[PDB]
């Protein structure tokens, strides 16, 4: 599925933090460390960040190539299989809440525009691309992202075979 | 809803590891600690256990009371709200992969009867209560619970308003 392959390629890109062509725990370790240095947050949030981002690999991605590096082909091949069973979606969707927890640096349980902008910036993206993605997730227009909005949009990104506004969940498509 | 409420109360009973009437991070920490004692896995897995278990609280239950200890009624009402929007199911089911990762002490991506049994024993249940639940989960009778099998069963537990074989997912109902 064209657009669907394109979304996976995009996600792969954004999460391949060190850009070496393979998803590894190292990507999440480094992303966390940068995030902890450069963002404003509650002091205790630095540990949360590390646990939650590394937990993406530890509890989810580790199951893809059983322990090591995931190349772009294996990623797509793997996800392709994973989305097949409508009853096991949480294996694909599971990481959203962890991403959410890391991004909520003031731990108020909502993601604000500033927190989202910082997130895009951690992924190496131009902060000026955040609003279009934020806006797609903020369905009630209250100017915040609730856990519910975040997971619903993220779920759409991963699962929709067709075009939707959530195709830009992880920034601009490659 | 009567049975659903019963299941929620049962999940609540189970995770309230100390039995103080409140679910707190400490529950998971103490559970982590006892889990490690009861199994006799390799060193590297000890940390996995801790990380995985506390991760249930850190990323999922903290969304319930802004970080404080959750009482039974608060728990059930939250759950009632959470299960209403099926598109957001991952907030509820999100923890299953975490539990899986903790229970698979030999990091082989499968849960054996031994491993499952330690999990039950761990939770204050007698290992004879286990086989009942195992077999409900092992839908292809190959004597191993795969990640997919674990989350499908767990999801039925959480989401089925009606009776099903998976109501015993967390052991005998209270
Ligand atoms: Ca990488
Ligand atoms: Ca926030
Ligand atoms: Ca909103
Ligand atoms: Ca407790
Ligand atoms: Ca195992
Ligand atoms: Ca099986």
Query: Is there a contact between B95 and A95 (Cβ–Cβ < 8 Å)?
Result: no
- What CATH number did the domain enclosing B17 receive? 1.10.238.10
Answer yes or no: are the C-beta atoms of A48 and A100 closer than 8 Å: no
- A22 beta partners: A71
Q: What distance in Å separates the CA atoms of residue A64 and residue A58, rounded to the nearest whole number?
A: 11
Q: Which two tokens stand for residue B84?
A: 């209403």
**CA neighbours closer than 13 Å in the CB half-sphere of residue A33:** 8
The C-alpha of A170 sits at a distance from chain B's nearest C-alpha, in angstroms, of 18
From the CA of A144, how far away is ligand 3's center (Å)?
A: 5
What DSSP assignment string belongs to B99-149? HHHHH-TT-SSSB-HHHHHHHHHHTT--TTSHHHHHHHH-TT-SS-B-HHH
Crossing angle of helices A95-103 and B43-59, rounded to 10°: 70
The DSSP string of A14-36 is: HH-TT-SSEE-HHHHHHHHHHHH
CA distance A58 to A45: 19
Neighbours of A87 (CB within 10 A): 11
Q: Is A140 annotated as a binding residue?
A: yes
- Retrieve residue A96's tokens: 């959203």
> ∠ CA B58-B18-B116 to the nearest 5 degrees?
75
Q: Give the residue among B36, B15, B19 at the shortest CA–CA distance from B171.
A: B15
> Of A88, A92, A159, which to mutate for an interface test with B (greatest number of B Cβ within 10 Å)?
A88
Put simply, the answer to whether B89 touches A93 (Cβ < 8 Å) is: yes
Give yes or no for a contact between A130 and A122, defined as CB atoms under 8 angstroms apart: no
* Residue B48 in tokens: 């996995």
Please tell me the distance between residue A65's alpha carbon and the centre of ligand 1 in angstroms.
14
Cα separation, B171 vs B76, whole angstroms = 18
Answer for the pair B122, B34: CB distance below 8 angstroms, yes or no. Answer: yes
Give the residues across from B61 on adjacent strands: none
Q: Look up residue B18 and give its two tokens.
A: 């100390």
Note down the domain range covering A157. 1-174
Question: Minimal CA–CA distance to A64: which of A34, A93, A24, A104?
Answer: A24
Residue of B nearest to A151 (CA): B88
Task: Tell me the technique behind this structure.
Answer: X-ray
Q: Which two tokens stand for residue A118?
A: 């910082």
Give the SS3 label for residue B20: coil
Strand partners, B22: B71
Contact (Cβ atoms closer than 8 angstroms) between residue A64 and residue A76:
no
Distances (CA, A) of B31 to A26, B97, B124: 28, 17, 10
CA within 13 Å, CB half, B104: 20
Output the DSSP codes for chain A.
-HHHHHHHHHHHHHH-TT-SSEE-HHHHHHHHHHHHHHS---TTHHHHHHHHHHHHHHHTGGGTTTTS-EEHHHHHHHHHHHTS-GGGTHHHHTHHHHHHHHH-TT-SSSEEHHHHHHHHHHTT--GGGHHHHHHHH-TT-SSEE-HHHHHHHHHHHHH-SS--GGGGTTSS--
Helical (H) or strand (E) element with B34: helix B25-38
Say if CB B25 and CB B57 are below 8 A apart.
Answer: yes
Report the interhelical angle of A45-59 vs A25-38 (nearest 10°): 160
Domain count, chain A: 1
Task: Note whether B109 contacts A151, CB cutoff 8 Å.
Answer: no
A107-127 residues labelled b (16+ CB within 10 A) or e (exposed):
eebbbbeebbbbbbbbeebee
Measure in Å the smallest separation between the Cα of B126 and chain A Cα atoms: 27
User: Using an 8 Å Cβ cutoff, are B118 and B49 in contact?
Assistant: no
């Amino acid at each position: 599925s064209d657009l669907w392959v394109q979304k996976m390629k995009t996600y792969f890109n954004r999460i391949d933090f060190d850009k070496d062509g393979a998803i590894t725990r190292m990507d999440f370790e480094s992303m966390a460390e940068r995030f902890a240095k450069e963002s404003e947050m509650k002091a205790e949030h630095a540990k949360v960040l590390m646990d939650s981002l590394t937990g993406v690999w530890d509890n989810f991605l580790t199951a893809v190539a059983g322990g090591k590096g995931i190349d772009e082909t294996t990623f797509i091949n793997s996800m392709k299989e994973m989305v097949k069973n409508p009853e096991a979606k949480s294996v694909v969707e599971g990481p959203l809440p962890l991403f959410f927890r890391a991004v909520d640096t003031n731990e108020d349980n909502n993601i604000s525009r500033d927190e989202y902008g910082i997130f895009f910036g951690m992924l190496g993206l131009d902060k000026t691309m955040a609003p279009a993605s934020f806006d797609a997730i903020d369905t009630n227009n209250d100017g915040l992202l609730s856990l519910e909005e975040f997971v619903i949009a993220g779920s759409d990104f991963f699962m929709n075979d067709g075009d939707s506004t959530n195709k830009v969940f992880w920034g601009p498509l490659v």
